[PDB]
Amino acid sequence: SSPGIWQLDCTHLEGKVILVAVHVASGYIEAEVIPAETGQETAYFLLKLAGRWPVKTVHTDNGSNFTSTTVKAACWWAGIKQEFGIPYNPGVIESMNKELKKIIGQVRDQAEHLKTAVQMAVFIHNKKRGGYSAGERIVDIIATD
Amino acid sequence: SSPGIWQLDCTHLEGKVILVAVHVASGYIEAEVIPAETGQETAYFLLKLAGRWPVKTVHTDNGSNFTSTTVKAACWWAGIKQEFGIPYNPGVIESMNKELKKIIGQVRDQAEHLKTAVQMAVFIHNKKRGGYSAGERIVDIIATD
Ligand SMILES: O=C(O)c1sccc1-n1c(Cl)ccc1Cl
């Protein structure tokens, strides 16, 4: 709902780790293939996200993701708080993650490296379209705000 | 001028390479520390950029940056053309690059890793403010378009 809310999770594919951020209000995605799930990678991703968009709160489906000193420090520096208004469903964000994995599978054979296929899939997801695309919606929501 | 125009260049610091993209109309920046200057890294950066913003043309101060088959293929896939309306000055974009290096130097001792300091500097640059910030201007320009 609020335009400052993002959700971050990781997904595994081909023995690699995909960090997926979803802007909750728009469905817009940013993603990165990272070598392993570590607090350092999560912290770095959060700082990059925060320099690009007005990130006020962040949610996740795996709370332990956010416990390291390194993540907390990135939080702290960028003024990011943890989001507590989205309950855990033992999910809309998890569906978009499954959609993204669907798109990855559909484009995977067109790229040599998984990391390329992920960015192809993000591009497809954000530009696909009343009826606007997620990329159009995020800029509208933020500009209006 | 046109909202689809970006400029990409590399900068060197501490034996590492910083790839800097500037949205020409707004002054908004995205940057990444990459291990070396290669066409693969440039291509990957361009795909990520293109999935996030409506990238129509790209300029650079080092034309040889864009000759590899890998960059051309990323171009091709994302529908990016080379920008030919910005002449080379043997520069506004080069000033912002120097501004960013100024900010990096000012925050460098607050982070262990250069890559963190770069993202701190991008955050500072994009959020600093009539009088709007570059981050505010890019979303306004794109939303209006
Ligand atoms: O580089 C640092 O000193 C800081 S300061 C706050 C987070 C980090 N960090 C990131 Cl981001 C990745 C690895 C580290 Cl350490």
Ligand SMILES: O=C(O)c1sccc1-n1c(Cl)ccc1Cl
């Ligand atoms: O192609 C589809 O059926 C759907 S459905 C939602 C996204 C996409 N998509 C893929 Cl996968 C590649 C290009 C597009 Cl558009």
Ligand SMILES: O=C(O)c1sccc1-n1c(Cl)ccc1Cl
């Ligand atoms: O992964 C690929 O097959 C393609 S397809 C077009 C560019 C690339 N690429 C990137 Cl992006 C980084 C390294 C490579 Cl290869």
Ligand SMILES: O=C(O)c1sccc1-n1c(Cl)ccc1Cl
């Ligand atoms: O601090 C300044 O003089 C300027 S001047 C332009 C940006 C900045 N800046 C830095 Cl460097 C850290 C925080 C800010 Cl704001």
